[PDB]
Symmetry: C4
């Protein structure tokens, strides 16, 4: 299926994925298309920060859903 | 099977692939041989920009076929 | 299962893994979450430097276990 | 099984591999241990340059064998 990933600016990425794909898989896809490494990526859906090892279906992300992509900064 | 990947300059990458490999697989092989990240890679065949999720058979890429590899720049 | 990875400062990383995951798999997950390339990671558990090709179960790393992550130099 | 990788300097890398691993698999393991990207790696055994897609058993590389790791430079 197809999903969308948008930065807050509105720049849209289109990804082909499977419901069983993990959030990490999506992150690697964003890296493939955008050069943005996974550790710099925070993905948000339904107001929730998406966890790497959990799947798209787990979060009920469906055909043509849109995730937001947010930059993840260093802490300590 | 074997395929070729050429920059517009003529420089040739020879790859060992399967028809079920995806375009992303091929990009990864190109990274493996040339150090060029997938996100900087645009592959072209039959006039068409090749999509990461599609397979070589999907685009009728057969043995000894040549893809063109082109630099993808930052935009929006 | 869940495991923790901590630097010597105490900074804590939480990872979802399988007992059949290799030590290299774990380093790949650390890279995923922290951007530290596997070659720069040394992982230690039970005093032992952890070998890449061995599994978590090979080392009897169980759930809620903690590993130490240390910087590996040239 | 265990194999050894050495530069022409003696520095010895010890790898755990399977006879069905590809040469690319080995380069990936070298990257994991040393940070050397696969494209910068030329591996040599029995006087030949090893091909990414071929397997360790394909080259008759057995346990406790030693491969040579050689720098690959930019060319054309
Ligand atoms: Cl290849
Ligand atoms: Cl647990
Ligand atoms: Cl190894």
């Amino acid at each position: 299926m197809q999903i969308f990933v948008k930065t807050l600016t509105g720049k849209t990425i289109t990804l082909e994925v499977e419901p069983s794909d993990t959030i990490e898989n999506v992150k690697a896809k964003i890296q493939d298309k955008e050069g943005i490494p996974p550790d710099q990526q925070r993905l948000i859906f339904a107001g929730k920060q998406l966890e790497d090892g959990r799947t798209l279906s787990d979060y009920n992300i469906q055909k043509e859903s849109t995730l937001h992509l947010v930059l993840r900064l260093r802490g300590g």
